[PDB]
Design a protein around this ligand. Structure first.
Ligand SMILES: *CCS(=O)(=O)Nc1cccc(Cc2nn(C(C)C)c3ncnc(N)c23)c1
Length: 261
């Protein structure tokens, strides 16, 4: 047992946040630290499989990645992570607080996410499941990447990844472009009214989502860059981070708030 093990008695599960595989709870660690806790229902997934999420988070540490705190690594297994007080970005966008978000806030959230993914990019990892349901929001609209699908949902997956299993940082870039549409539509499902197979077929034929209402063309253009057919033609996360951080000075200095963005 490495330095990450904690005593089972040091961990209190207070409120259940999600179910599934296992559960997610808000709780307390050492009676003083607010935390998020993921459980594994014994005999529903390989312990080695479930813990893989924790192996990755021991090596990846960055202010825009939900931080690993601790593990109880024998069945019943617990993974303890940083508590993110505002829940999933997806529920956030859809809910009462989403209503009032405007383009400056939404681009700043995108820049944060892009910053976490630039880190992942520098570390030579791959996320594989980047999307708004896997970003968590904290105090002051901080957004952090969570739920690594692995290390190194067809509507969010680059075509080369979905078809041939070629998952790379560049298929994450594609997913990020899709995440940008979730941000600018307040969390609507991408490709509205299309089923998975129609999406895959149309994306192959060069189909791409149009510019969302009130979203500047310059931001939709960035989405289009993330969606280039050739993976190696897509921008880096270092590029996306910089572009989004500088957006309101370098790209749309004339931005005026509208009804929804
Ligand atoms: C150590 C971070 S991790 O992504 O690898 N594992 C982990 C462990 C516990 C909880 C989460 C993600 C999560 N989900 N939710 C609700 C269900 C939307 C949370 N609320 C608050 N805080 C966190 N971390 C939440 C990830």
């Amino acid at each position: 047992k490495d330095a990450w093990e904690i005593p089972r008695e040091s961990l209190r599960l207070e409120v259940k946040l999600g179910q599934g595989f296992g559960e997610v709870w808000m709780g307390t660690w050492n009676g003083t630290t607010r935390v998020a806790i993921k459980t594994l229902k014994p005999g529903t997934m390989s312990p080695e499989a479930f813990l893989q999420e924790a192996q990755v988070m021991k090596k990846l540490r960055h202010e825009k990645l939900v931080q690993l705190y601790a593990v109880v690594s024998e069945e019943p297994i617990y993974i303890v992570c940083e508590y993110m007080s505002k829940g999933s970005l997806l529920d956030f966008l859809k809910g009462e607080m989403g209503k009032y978000l405007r383009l400056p806030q939404l681009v700043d959230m995108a820049a944060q996410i892009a910053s976490g993914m630039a880190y992942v990019e520098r570390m030579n990892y791959v996320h594989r499941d980047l999307r708004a349901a896997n970003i968590l929001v904290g105090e002051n609209l901080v957004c952090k990447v969570a739920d690594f699908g692995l290390a190194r949902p067809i509507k969010w997956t680059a075509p080369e990844a979905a078809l041939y299993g070629r998952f790379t940082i560049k298929s994450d870039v594609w997913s990020f472009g899709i995440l940008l549409t979730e941000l600018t539509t307040k969390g609507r499902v991408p490709y509205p009214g299309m089923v998975n197979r129609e999406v895959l077929d149309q994306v192959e034929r060069g189909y791409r989502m149009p510019c969302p209402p009130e979203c500047p063309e310059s931001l939709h253009d960035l989405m289009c860059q993330c969606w280039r057919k050739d993976p190696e033609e897509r921008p880096t996360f270092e590029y996306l981070q910089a572009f989004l951080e500088d957006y309101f000075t370098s790209t749309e200095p004339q931005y005026q708030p509208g009804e929804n963005l």
